Design a protein around this ligand. Sequence first.
Ligand SMILES: Cc1ccnc(S(N)(=O)=O)n1
Ligand SMILES: [Zn+2]
Length: 256
Amino acid sequence: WGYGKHNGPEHWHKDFPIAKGERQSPVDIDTHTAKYDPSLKPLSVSYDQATSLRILNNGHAFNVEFDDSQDKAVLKGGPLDGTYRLIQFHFHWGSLDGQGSEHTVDKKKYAAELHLVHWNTKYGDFGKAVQQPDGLAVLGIFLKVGSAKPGLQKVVDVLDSIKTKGKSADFTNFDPRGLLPESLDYWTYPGSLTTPPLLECVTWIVLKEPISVSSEQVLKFRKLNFNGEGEPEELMVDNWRPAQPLKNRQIKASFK
Ligand SMILES: Cc1ccnc(S(N)(=O)=O)n1
Ligand SMILES: [Zn+2]
C-alpha cells in the first residue's frame, strides 16, 4: 500500500476491507454542524517528562518515537476515560501548500497535519490497544505556512539523515511541547487509523488552532523519499488520506 495512483487510498479496501467501514478517518469537520458539549472536560496534555528516542523514515512518513515504558508523556481528560501514553508522532503533508492535511475544516485543506499518537494504558501496550474501540487517542494539529515554528526546527534539521525508507537516527531530548498551539480548543469524534491497517480504534481530538510553520520548514519535509536508498527517487509528498464518509457520527466541540 502507498499513496500512488496504483496503490493509494482508493485501493486500500482490497487488502483492508475496513477501509469502507462505519467509523473511518479522516473526516471533514463541518464547524456549523459540530455540537458544543459543555460537558467535555479540559484536555490535559502532560508532556513534561517526554523522552524521545529515535526518528525513522518508514516509507510512508517519518515517526519520532518515544520511550513509552513508563507514564511520562500522557494525554487525559476531554472525551477520554483514563490515561493515554504518547508513543510517537508523525505528519502528513502535501506537494503544495494548498493540500496535505487529512482532516479538513469546512472542506479547507491545511498544508500538513501533525498526529501525536497515544495508547490507552488499560490495555498494557500499543499492539493490544489497537484491537480495542477505545485503544488510541490521536491528537491532530493542523499546520499552515507562514511564520516558522521554532520548536519544529530540530526535526527539520535531522531529516537529511533519514532521507530514504528504512533509515533511522538518534533523536533524544526532543520536547513535543514546542509543537503545540496556544489553545487546546478541539473537536472530537470516534474514528480510525488513517493508514493501513485502518483499525477503528481511535478517539480523534483535533485542535482548532493551527500552528504556523515556514515555507522553508515544509519544503524540507518534501525532500524526503518514499523509496529506499539506491532506488529511483519518488518524493515523499501527498501522504494523506482524503476525508471519509461521516456515516453515523457526531463531531463534538469543546468550545462554542
Ligand atoms: C501509528 C499509526 C498507524 C496508522 N495510522 C496512524 S494515524 N495516521 O491514524 O495517526 N497512526
Ligand atoms: Zn497520521
